[PDB]
Amino acid sequence: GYDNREIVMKYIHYKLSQRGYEEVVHLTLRQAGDDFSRRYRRDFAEMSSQLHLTPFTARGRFATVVEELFRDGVNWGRIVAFFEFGGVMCVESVNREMSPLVDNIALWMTEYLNRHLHTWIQDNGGWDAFVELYGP
Numbered sequence: 001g002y003d004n005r006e007i008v009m010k011y012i013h014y015k016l017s018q019r020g021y022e023e024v025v026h027l028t029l030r031q032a033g034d035d036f037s038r039r040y041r042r043d044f045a046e047m048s049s050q051l052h053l054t055p056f057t058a059r060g061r062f063a064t065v066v067e068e069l070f071r072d073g074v075n076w077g078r079i080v081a082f083f084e085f086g087g088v089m090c091v092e093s094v095n096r097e098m099s100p101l102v103d104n105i106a107l108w109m110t111e112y113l114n115r116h117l118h119t120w121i122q123d124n125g126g127w128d129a130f131v132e133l134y135g136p
């Protein structure tokens, strides 16, 4: 598991393509995110209709959700839910003719990873351990 920016970009591109717009770690994360959205279906649907994205509320919407998600700490499932949440935000932004928000969201996700998730990820064997646990 190399660069966080690359992980974020490859993830967002996939989520957007699935909705008609535009390495083992990238594939494992993709598969995990699709599994998460299927298992927690009501949470997924509730999140998708509770963003109410506008040009000047997207930053605040991202901050409030990511704070609640990791309030009690970090684990692999919560990191998967964080990528899925980023995906939902990007898809809604493109759907609402606010596609430059995708670049802002990608930056907020990369910054959150580098600054607030990096220590946990490193202390738990990095993305390689995520692949050892959940990959092929």
Ligand SMILES: CN(C)CCOc1cccc(-c2ccc(Cl)cc2)c1CN1CCN(c2ccc(C(=O)NS(=O)(=O)c3ccc(NCC4CCOCC4)c([N+](=O)[O-])c3)c(Oc3ccc4[nH]ccc4c3)c2)CC1
Pocket: 028, 031, 032, 033, 035, 036, 039, 040, 043, 044, 047, 065, 066, 068, 069, 075, 076, 077, 078, 080, 081, 082, 084, 085, 088, 134, 135
């Ligand atoms: C109660 N309040 C606190 C509510 C507020 O909650 C808020 C607050 C804020 C936001 C949101 C929010 C709502 C909507 C959106 Cl879109 C985003 C976020 C919510 C909503 N929640 C966010 C956190 N969610 C969690 C957390 C941890 C775990 C966990 O870790 N479970 S697990 O059994 O360890 C596990 C099992 C299998 C696998 N992968 C296996 C795959 C198979 C396919 O091939 C690849 C590997 C993994 N894994 O990959 O990490 C781990 C969890 O469950 C699963 C179960 C199956 C899963 N599948 C892949 C991941 C996954 C996680 C669920 C619950 C919902």
